[PDB]
Design a binder for these strands. Sequence first.
RNA 1: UUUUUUUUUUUUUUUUUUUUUUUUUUUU
RNA 2: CUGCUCAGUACGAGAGGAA
RNA 3: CUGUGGUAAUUCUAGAG
RNA 4: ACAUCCAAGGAAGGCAGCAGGCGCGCAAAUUACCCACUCCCGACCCGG
RNA 5: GCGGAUUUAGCUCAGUUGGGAGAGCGCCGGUCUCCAAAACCGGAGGUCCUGUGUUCGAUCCACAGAAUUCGCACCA
RNA 6: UGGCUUGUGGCGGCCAAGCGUUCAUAGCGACGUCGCUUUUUGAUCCUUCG
RNA 7: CGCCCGUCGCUACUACCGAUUGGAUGGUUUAGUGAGGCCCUCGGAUCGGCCCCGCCGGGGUCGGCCCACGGCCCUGGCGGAGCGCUGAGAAGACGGUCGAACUUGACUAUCUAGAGGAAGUAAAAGUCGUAACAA
Lengths: 134, 427
Amino acid sequence: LRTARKLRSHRRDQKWHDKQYKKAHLGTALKANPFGGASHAKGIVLEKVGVEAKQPNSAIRKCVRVQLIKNGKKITAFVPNDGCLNFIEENDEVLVAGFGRKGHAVGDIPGVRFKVVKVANVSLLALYKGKKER
Amino acid sequence: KPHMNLVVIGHVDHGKSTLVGHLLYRLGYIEEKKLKELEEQAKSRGKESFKFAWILDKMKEERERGITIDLTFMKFETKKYVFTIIDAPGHRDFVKNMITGASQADAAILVVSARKGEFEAGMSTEGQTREHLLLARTMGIEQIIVAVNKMDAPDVNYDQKRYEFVVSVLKKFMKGLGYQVDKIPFIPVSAWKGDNLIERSPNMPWYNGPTLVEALDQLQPPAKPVDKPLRIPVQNVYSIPGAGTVPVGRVETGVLRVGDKVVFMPPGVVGEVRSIEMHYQQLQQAEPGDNIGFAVRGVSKSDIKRGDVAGHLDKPPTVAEEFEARIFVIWHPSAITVGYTPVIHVHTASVSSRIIEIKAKLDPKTGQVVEQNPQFLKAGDAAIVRFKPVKPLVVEKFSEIPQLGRFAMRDMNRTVGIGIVTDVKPA
RNA sequence: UUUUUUUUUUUUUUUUUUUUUUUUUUUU
RNA sequence: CUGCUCAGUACGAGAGGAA
RNA sequence: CUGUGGUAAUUCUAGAG
RNA sequence: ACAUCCAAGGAAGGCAGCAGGCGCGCAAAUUACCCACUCCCGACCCGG
RNA sequence: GCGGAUUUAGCUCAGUUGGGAGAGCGCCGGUCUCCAAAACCGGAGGUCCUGUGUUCGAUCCACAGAAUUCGCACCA
RNA sequence: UGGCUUGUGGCGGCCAAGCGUUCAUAGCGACGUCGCUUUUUGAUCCUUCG
RNA sequence: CGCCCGUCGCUACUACCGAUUGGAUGGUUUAGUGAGGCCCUCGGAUCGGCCCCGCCGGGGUCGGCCCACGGCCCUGGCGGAGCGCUGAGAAGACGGUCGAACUUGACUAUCUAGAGGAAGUAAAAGUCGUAACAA
Ligand SMILES: *C(=O)[C@@H](N)Cc1ccccc1
């Protein structure tokens, strides 16, 4: 009963072995991405580049490199809807957000951790269906 | 005391800004200490004779070059009226600015130099006495006073023969434009000396007419269409510490009150009036004729520009997907066909517009069709034509709101034609 | 008393993209 | 050699630009 | 509080009763 | 350390208090009405 | 507001001094194959961004627009 | 060092097929040919090792 | 006709190394300098009260018919006006502790530029050899 401190100290230190716990523990989340841990960042379409799918899946994926506002850093982004390219023009303000928990992109996608959802401060769904905007 | 808008127009260097400045001075609207400082600054930069003009011309490029570039607005008050006076540039590069000025005006002072060669130049084929007179007519200015200026100049020296020469030339031309020439004062003045500005001049005994101030009082105030829907073409947009983004412009029709919700077309952005100001005096309401700045909550300066039009939400300004007009062709070096794309100067806006069809050539005097779908138009022709603006443009039918329904057509920096809009297809 | 037993590799590197299909009581 | 007036001038469709 | 004063300007403020 | 107007001499300021502008961004309002309530502050009222 | 660049084939770029454009990919098509990859053949494709001026003639020059860019100015 | 000579270097020149959008010379000139030059370099051995 | 390894050639992205004694940022600071208030040795623009003398006005007593007059005590006005003594009292000023801020460097914490060098990862397949799985 008098050896409480060792178990107390032991737990916290052995705990370091948990990588997600570790992630919160080290100021890394703030600095591991262009966002700074942020869910959404406004950006500019520097170029639009077609890319090739990975493994047996064969496809041309719509990809945009984006210059961020406060951050000012290069970003690799994924264009989502079918003919969004028709509606994506260079240097139009774009809001970007991530896919399924931070880390790995959709298995089909190559090196993109980010998704494009707004064009000119307008959501994607509106351009995509005829009834909304044009 | 009724309010009126005055535009000052005329050929480059003929004396527009010197007149306005000097008039404001002897009317005591300008601090003697400031006139003193301006004069010293003017002399030290090699430009003594610009001391009155520099009351109006403030921009670095205006002062460097000794010309007016864009509009300046000044309030002064006569015996009968309060005027907003608008100083417009003569330089051919900035006739687009002069046109926005005319669109906001109730009356015009045409300033015309009597100096040898200066007059003839202004009245020449490509001169701005000629051009400004034409544009003032088309933007719907009927009341005009002409200041035959620089009578003091040595090559003039108050000569009545020179004066009567410029008057007659000016009369023959002005009558061909449709002006009622018998009614309009031709005052011999010296913007620089002061002759006949506010008091009568001993140097010109032979002159019996009004002084310029007297001529102002003899003007008549225009109809106030408060029952038509609110329309305010924006002339400029400022971003002001305390207010935020404040469009400026003259209320053409309707009324505007603090609290109002307003929309700006063609962008479609909506804000709310925090405040209203005319000549630094805060207002609660503004009616037609009021030349105002209005602060707008919820609107960014980048959303709105000159040539946009503000109306209330229930009756928003019309955006033309296309529009129809009756036009007369003043000048063209070849011919105008379907597809011709001059810039359209309407109210405060200026947007290139493509002629998609020429429905009919008309006899310029009678208005009857002389040919369905002519192969082309040329100088001297009148016509009914269809117009598709290159970018979103606000226009109204002349029959409904005439101040948003009259226009000039310009191309290669010349005035090519004039027009009234007879119909609009809304966006 | 009853048992070994020699022989030993002389010569066998590599094989482009993509591969595929599954679900239940109740008797007439 | 430079400046001030010469002068934003004449000459230019402008850009410009003197002596 | 009387009167007498100066400054582009500020809750400036003298001197005299 | 910012930075406002300079009659060329000078004079000011600390809105991290309400409103209101800008900025910043993924991200938060209006230049309103009032002491009636709750209190509090000044002296024997009822001011603020 | 002012001023410079840039706009040429599906893509990316070269030409030019007014007689009217040229290449690399492309990509597509065919042969072979389950289909591609490789290989081998084949493809003719541009209002030279737009208007006007000049000119006998404008891709080119002049003057004017658009769109993108980049300087500079303005500052309710 | 100086010196003859000037290949080499440098510079002009007659002729005008060409450039120069029309045209040869406004401004330039193939080839071909006449030369001037002695701050390059070269060949020569004349003056200087008494 | 199964899996499978590594160098070498494209293309991209991370991180390591790095000539510039490298640049940028923010915290604690050594030293040299020092505004400004404040305590404190002074100073002393200035102001009033009493000191002495002379002159008049007024109240109360004494020597005078007076009245002026003189003495005491208390005020008013003038000269030696400040000439003798006292008190509070602005500028300034001795020497201070506090201590802004300037410079000169330190030092951490926090990013970062770069010819090149060196891994990897996308990695499907081009090119070399058979290492591992069946002694
Ligand atoms: C703001 O000052 C306006 N009300 C007046 C104005 C100033 C500058 C430019 C345009 C308008």
